[PDB]
Tab-separated table of C-alpha atoms (C1' of nucleotides) and ligand atoms in Angstrom:
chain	number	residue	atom	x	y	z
A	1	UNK	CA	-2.448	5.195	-10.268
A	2	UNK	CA	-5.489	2.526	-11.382
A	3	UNK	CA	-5.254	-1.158	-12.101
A	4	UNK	CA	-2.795	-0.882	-15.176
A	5	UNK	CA	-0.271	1.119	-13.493
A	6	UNK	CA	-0.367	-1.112	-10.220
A	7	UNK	CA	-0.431	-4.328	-12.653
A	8	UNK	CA	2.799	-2.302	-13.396
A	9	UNK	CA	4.667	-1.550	-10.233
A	10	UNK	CA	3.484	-5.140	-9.665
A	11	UNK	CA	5.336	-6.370	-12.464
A	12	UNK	CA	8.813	-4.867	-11.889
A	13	UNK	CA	9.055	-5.373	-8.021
A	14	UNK	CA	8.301	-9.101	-8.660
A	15	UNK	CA	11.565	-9.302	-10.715
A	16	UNK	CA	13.355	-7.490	-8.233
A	17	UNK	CA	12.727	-8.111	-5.331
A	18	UNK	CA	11.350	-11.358	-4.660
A	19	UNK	CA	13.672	-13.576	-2.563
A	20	UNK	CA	14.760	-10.444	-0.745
A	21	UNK	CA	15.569	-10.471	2.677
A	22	UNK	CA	14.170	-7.325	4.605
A	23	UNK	CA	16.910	-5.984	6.597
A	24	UNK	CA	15.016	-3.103	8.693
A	25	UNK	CA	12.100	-0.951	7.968
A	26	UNK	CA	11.993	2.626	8.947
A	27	UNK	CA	9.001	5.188	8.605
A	28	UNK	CA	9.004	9.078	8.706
A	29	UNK	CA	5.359	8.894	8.507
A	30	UNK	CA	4.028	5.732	10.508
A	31	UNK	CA	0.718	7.144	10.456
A	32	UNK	CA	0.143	5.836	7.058
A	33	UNK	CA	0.817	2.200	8.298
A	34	UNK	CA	-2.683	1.517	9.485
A	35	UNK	CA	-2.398	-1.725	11.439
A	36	UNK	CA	0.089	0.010	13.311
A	37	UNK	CA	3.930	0.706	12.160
A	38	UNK	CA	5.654	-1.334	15.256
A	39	UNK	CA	3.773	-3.727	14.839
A	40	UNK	CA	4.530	-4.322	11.178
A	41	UNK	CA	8.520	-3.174	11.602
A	42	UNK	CA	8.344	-6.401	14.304
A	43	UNK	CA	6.407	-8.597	12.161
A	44	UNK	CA	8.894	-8.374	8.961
A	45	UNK	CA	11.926	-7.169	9.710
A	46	UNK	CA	14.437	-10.285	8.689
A	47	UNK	CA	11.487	-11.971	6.696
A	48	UNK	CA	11.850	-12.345	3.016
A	49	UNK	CA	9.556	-11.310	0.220
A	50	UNK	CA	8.268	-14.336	-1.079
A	51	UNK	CA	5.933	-12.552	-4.237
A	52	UNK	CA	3.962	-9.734	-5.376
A	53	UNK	CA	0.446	-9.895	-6.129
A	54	UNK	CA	-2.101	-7.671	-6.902
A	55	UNK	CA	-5.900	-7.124	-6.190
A	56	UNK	CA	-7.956	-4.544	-7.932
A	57	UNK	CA	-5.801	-1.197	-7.451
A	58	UNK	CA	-3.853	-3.431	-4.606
A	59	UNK	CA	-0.480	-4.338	-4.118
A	60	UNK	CA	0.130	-7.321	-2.137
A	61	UNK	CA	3.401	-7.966	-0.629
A	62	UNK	CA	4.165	-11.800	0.484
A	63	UNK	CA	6.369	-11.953	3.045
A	64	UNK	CA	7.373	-14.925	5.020
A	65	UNK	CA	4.263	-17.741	4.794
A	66	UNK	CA	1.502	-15.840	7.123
A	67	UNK	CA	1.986	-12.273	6.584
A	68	UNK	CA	0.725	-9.690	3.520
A	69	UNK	CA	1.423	-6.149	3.066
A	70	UNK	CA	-1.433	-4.636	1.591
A	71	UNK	CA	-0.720	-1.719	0.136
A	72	UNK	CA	-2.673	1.218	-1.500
A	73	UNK	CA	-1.273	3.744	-3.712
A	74	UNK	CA	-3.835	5.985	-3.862
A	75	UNK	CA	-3.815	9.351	-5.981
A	76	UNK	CA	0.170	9.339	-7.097
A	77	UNK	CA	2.108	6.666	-4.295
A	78	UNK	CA	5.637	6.075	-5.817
A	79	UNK	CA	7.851	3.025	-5.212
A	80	UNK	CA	11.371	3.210	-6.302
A	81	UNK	CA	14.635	1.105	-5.658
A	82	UNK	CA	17.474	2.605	-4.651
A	83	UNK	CA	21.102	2.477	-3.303
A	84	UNK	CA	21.305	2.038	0.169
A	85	UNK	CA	23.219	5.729	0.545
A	86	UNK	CA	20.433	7.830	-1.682
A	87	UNK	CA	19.008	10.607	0.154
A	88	UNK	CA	15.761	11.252	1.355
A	89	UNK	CA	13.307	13.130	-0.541
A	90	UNK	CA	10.793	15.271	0.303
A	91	UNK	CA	7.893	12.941	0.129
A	92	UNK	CA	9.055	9.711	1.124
A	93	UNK	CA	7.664	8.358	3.956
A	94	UNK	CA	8.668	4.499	4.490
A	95	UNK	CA	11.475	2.293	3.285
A	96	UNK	CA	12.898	-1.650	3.342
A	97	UNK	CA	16.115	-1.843	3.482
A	98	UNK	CA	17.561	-5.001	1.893
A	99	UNK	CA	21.181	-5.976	2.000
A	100	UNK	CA	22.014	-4.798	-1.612
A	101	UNK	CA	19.265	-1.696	-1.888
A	102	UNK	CA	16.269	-0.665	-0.509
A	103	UNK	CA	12.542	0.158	-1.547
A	104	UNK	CA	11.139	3.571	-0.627
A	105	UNK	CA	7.407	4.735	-0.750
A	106	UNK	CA	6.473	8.392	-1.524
A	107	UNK	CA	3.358	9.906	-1.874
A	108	UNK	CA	3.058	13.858	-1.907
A	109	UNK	CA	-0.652	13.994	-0.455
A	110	UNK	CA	-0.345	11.122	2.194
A	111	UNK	CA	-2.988	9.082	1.145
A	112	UNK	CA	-1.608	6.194	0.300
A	113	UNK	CA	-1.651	3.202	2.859
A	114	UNK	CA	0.000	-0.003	4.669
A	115	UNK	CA	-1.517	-2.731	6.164
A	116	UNK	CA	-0.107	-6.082	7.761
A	117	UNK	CA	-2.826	-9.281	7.239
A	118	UNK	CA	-1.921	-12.675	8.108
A	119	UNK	CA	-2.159	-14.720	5.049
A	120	UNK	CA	-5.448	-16.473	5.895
A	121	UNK	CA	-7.086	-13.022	6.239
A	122	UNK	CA	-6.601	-11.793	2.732
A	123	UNK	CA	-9.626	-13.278	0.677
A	124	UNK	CA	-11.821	-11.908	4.077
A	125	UNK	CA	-10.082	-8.458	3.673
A	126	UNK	CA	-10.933	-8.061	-0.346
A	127	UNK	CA	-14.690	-9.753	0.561
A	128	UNK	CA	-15.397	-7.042	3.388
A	129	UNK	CA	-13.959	-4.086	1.062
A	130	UNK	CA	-17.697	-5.650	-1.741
A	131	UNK	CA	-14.533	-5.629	-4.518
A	132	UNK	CA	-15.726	-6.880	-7.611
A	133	UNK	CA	-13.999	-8.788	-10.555
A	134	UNK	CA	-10.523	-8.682	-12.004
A	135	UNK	CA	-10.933	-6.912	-15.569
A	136	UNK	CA	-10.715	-10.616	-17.371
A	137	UNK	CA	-12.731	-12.445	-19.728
A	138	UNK	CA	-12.513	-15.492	-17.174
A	139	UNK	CA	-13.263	-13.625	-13.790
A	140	UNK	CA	-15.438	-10.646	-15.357
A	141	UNK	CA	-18.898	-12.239	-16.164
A	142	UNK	CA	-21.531	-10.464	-18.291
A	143	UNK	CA	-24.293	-11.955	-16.929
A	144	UNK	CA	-23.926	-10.993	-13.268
A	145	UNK	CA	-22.778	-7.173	-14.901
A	146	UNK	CA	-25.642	-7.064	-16.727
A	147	UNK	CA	-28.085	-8.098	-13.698
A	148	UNK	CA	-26.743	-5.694	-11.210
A	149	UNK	CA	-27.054	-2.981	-13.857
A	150	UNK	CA	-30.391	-3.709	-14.241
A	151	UNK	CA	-31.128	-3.158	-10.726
A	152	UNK	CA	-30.131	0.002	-10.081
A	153	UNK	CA	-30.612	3.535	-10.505
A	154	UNK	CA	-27.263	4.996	-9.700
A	155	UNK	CA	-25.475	6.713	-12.868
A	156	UNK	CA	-22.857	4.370	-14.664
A	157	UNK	CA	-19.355	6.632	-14.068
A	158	UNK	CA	-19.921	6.940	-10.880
A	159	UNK	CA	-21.230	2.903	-10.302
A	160	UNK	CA	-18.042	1.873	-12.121
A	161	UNK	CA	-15.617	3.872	-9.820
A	162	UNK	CA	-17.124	2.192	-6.993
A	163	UNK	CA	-15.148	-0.849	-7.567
A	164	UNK	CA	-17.749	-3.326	-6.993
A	165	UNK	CA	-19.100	-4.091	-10.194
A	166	UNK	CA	-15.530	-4.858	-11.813
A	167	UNK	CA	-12.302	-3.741	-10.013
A	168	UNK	CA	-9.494	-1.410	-11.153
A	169	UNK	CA	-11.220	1.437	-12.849
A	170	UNK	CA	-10.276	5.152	-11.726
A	171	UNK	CA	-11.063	8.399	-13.602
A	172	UNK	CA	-8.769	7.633	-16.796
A	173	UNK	CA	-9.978	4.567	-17.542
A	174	UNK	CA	-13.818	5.121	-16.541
A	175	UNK	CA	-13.634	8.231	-18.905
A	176	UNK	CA	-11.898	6.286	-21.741
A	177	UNK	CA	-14.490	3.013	-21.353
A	178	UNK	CA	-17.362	5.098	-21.505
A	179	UNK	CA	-16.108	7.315	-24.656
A	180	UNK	CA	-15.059	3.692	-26.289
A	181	UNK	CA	-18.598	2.084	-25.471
A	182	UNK	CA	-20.488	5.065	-26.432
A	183	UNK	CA	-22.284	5.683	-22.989
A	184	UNK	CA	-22.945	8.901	-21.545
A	185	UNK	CA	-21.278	8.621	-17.762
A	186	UNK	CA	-24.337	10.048	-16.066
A	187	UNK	CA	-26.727	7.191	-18.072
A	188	UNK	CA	-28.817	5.392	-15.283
A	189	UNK	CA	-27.632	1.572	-15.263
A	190	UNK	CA	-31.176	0.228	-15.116
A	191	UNK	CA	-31.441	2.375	-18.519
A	192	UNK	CA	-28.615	0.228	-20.213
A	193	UNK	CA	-29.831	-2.276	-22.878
A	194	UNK	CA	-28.279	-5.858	-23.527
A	195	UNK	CA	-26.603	-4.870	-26.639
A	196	UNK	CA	-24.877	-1.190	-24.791
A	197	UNK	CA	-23.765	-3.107	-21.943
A	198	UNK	CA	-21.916	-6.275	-23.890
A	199	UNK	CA	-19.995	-3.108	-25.583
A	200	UNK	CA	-19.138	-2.095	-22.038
A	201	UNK	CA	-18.153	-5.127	-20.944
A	202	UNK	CA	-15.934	-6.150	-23.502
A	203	UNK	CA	-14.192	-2.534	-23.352
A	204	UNK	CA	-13.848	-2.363	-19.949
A	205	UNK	CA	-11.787	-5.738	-20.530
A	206	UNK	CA	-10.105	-4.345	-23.553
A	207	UNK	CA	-9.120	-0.241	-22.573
A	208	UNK	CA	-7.224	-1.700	-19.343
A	209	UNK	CA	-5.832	-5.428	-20.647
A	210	UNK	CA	-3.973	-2.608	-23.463
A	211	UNK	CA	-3.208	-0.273	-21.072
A	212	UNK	CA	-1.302	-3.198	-18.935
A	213	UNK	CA	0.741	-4.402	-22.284
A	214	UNK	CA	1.658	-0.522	-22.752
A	215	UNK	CA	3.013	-0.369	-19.385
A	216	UNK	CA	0.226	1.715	-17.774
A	217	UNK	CA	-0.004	5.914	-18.599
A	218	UNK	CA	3.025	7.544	-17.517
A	219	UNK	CA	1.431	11.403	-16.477
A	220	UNK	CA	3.839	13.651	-15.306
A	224	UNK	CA	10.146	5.668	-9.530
A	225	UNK	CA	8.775	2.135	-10.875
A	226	UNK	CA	6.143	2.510	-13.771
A	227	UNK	CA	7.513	5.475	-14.959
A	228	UNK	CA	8.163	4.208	-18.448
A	229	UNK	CA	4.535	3.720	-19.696
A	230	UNK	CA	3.305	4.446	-23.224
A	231	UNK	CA	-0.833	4.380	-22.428
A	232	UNK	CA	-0.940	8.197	-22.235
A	233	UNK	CA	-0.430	8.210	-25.584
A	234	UNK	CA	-3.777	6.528	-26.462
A	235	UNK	CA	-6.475	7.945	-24.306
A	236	UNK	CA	-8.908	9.348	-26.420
A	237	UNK	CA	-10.565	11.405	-23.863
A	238	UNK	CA	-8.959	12.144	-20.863
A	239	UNK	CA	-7.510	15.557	-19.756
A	240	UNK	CA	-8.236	16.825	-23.460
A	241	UNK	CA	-10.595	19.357	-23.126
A	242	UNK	CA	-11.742	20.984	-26.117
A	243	UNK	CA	-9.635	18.885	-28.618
A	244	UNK	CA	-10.806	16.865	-31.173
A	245	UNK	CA	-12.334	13.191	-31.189
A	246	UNK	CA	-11.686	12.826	-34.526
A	247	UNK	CA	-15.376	12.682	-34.946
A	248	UNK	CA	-15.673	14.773	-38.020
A	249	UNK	CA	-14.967	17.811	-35.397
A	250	UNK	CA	-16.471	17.081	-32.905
A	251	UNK	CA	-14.835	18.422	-29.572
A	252	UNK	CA	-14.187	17.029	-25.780
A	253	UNK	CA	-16.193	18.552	-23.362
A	254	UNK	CA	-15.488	18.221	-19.182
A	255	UNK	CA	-18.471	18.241	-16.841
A	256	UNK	CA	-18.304	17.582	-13.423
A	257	UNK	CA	-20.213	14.183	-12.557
A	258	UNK	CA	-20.558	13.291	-8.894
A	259	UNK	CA	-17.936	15.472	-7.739
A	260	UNK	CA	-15.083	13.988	-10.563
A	261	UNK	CA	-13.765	15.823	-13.792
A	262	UNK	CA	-15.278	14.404	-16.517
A	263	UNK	CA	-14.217	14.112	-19.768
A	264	UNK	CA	-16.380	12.598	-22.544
A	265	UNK	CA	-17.923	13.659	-26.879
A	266	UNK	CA	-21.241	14.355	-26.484
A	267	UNK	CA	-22.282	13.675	-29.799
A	268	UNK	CA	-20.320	10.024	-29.394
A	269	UNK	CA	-22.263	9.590	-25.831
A	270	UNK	CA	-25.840	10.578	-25.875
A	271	UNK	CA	-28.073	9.170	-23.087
B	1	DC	C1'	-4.706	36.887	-1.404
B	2	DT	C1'	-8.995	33.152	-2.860
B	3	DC	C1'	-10.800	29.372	-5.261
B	4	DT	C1'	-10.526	25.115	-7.877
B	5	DT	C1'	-8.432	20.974	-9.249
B	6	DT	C1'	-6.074	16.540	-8.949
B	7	DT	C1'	-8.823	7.195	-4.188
B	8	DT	C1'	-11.282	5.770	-0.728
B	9	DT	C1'	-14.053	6.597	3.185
B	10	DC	C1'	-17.006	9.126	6.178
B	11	DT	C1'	-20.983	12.391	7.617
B	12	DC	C1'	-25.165	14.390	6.887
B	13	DG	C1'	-29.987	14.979	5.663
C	1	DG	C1'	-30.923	2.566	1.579
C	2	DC	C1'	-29.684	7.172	-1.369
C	3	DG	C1'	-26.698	11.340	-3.211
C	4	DA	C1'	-24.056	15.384	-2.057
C	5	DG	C1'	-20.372	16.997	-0.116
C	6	DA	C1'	-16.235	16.787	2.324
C	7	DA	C1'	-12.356	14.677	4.646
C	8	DA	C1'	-7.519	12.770	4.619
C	9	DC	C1'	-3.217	16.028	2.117
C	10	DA	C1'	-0.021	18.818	-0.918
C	11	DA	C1'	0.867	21.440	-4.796
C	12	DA	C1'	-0.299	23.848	-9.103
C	13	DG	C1'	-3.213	26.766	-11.741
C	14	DA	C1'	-6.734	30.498	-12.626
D	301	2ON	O1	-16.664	5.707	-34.167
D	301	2ON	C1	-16.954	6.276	-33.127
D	301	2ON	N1	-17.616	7.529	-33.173
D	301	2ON	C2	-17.956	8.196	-31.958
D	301	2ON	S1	-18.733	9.670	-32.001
D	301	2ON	N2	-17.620	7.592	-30.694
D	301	2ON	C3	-16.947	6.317	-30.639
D	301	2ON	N3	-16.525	5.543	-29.583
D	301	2ON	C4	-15.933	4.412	-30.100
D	301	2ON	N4	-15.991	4.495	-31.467
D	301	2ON	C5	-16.613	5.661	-31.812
DNA sequence: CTCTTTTTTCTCG
DNA sequence: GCGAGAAACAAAGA
């Protein structure tokens, strides 16, 4: 998932399953529980969920006062709620169990994570991990973006995906800002003039603040139900049109990610 | 059969 | 510092 989809999950466990008791915790994969799965199966167990909140591509679990489960979804983590008697599937790998339900984590590739952080160690966490803004109008500031465009060379796709000038783009979104902005995704930031990168600003802002009303993009549990997918302009469309009086979708590779962008719309 | 493709972090030169 | 490439992993497609 990226930021919309997480803003998502976020969104749905917070009316379910705040004020929850957590009964036990089991794992059949601990190894994704990197402060240590014992430790964290000790720290909640009989704790209840206070809140959700979210950070970036984040999930933050509040549970009791001084504990947070950070947790990252990765590539395609799933949370669902189910019935206490639902069988396992294939790729789950941890659950809660409340009294009334419990709340299962899948992820098919493993990559997804878990980590337990007392409370007064989550700002340090986020400041340690350089991530940048929420995608706001009050926490994103042009000024700063602009700046640290200016001083570098790197290329702008793969700048944005690094999280640290503005947090919660991932390879759907980056593709669809740049497309929206008109910015080729291998254009060198320092290139960028004041006029291109207000555009990208203001998109950035705009392509996921929509995406979070729609629900996220449902491709291919919680967040299932999205209706985003049905707007991206870009993305995974490979030779059809942009609407651009014909114009056609090409896919490059750009440091090592697909890459889908209209040439004509995104010159250098 | 092989190869490529689909978030963050780590190694290497 | 930088970029390139690969790792973590599983499954689907060419
Ligand atoms: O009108 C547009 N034409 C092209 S080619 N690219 C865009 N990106 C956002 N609007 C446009």
């Amino acid at each position: 998932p990226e930021l919309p989809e997480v803003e998502t999950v976020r969104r749905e466990l917070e009316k379910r399953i705040v004020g929850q008791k957590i009964i036990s915790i089991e794992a059949t994969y601990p190894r994704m529980v990197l402060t240590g799965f014992e430790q964290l199966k000790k720290e909640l167990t009989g704790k209840t969920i206070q809140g959700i909140s979210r950070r970036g591509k984040y999930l933050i679990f509040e549970i009791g006062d001084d504990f947070r489960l950070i947790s990252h979804l990765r590539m395609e983590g799933k949370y669902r709620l189910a019935t206490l008697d639902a069988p396992r599937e294939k790729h789950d790998h941890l659950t809660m169990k409340f009294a009334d339900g419990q709340l299962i984590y899948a992820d098919v590739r493993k990559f997804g994570t878990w980590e337990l952080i007392s409370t007064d160690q989550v700002l340090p966490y986020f400041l340690k991990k350089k991530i940048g803004p929420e995608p706001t109008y009050e926490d994103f500031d042009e000024k700063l973006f602009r700046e640290k465009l200016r001083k570098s060379t790197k290329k702008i796709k793969p700048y944005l995906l690094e999280q640290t000038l503005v947090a919660g783009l991932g390879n759907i979104y980056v593709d669809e800002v740049l497309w929206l902005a008109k910015i080729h995704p291998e254009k060198e930031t320092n290139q960028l003039i004041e006029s291109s990168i207000h555009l990208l600003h203001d998109s950035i802002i705009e392509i996921l603040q929509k995406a979070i009303k729609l629900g996220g993009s449902s491709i291919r549990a919680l967040g299932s139900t999205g209706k985003m997918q049905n707007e991206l302009q870009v993305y995974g469309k490979t030779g059809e049109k942009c609407s651009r009086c014909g114009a056609e979708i090409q896919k490059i590779k750009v440091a090592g990610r697909g890459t889908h962008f209209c040439p004509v719309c995104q010159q250098k």
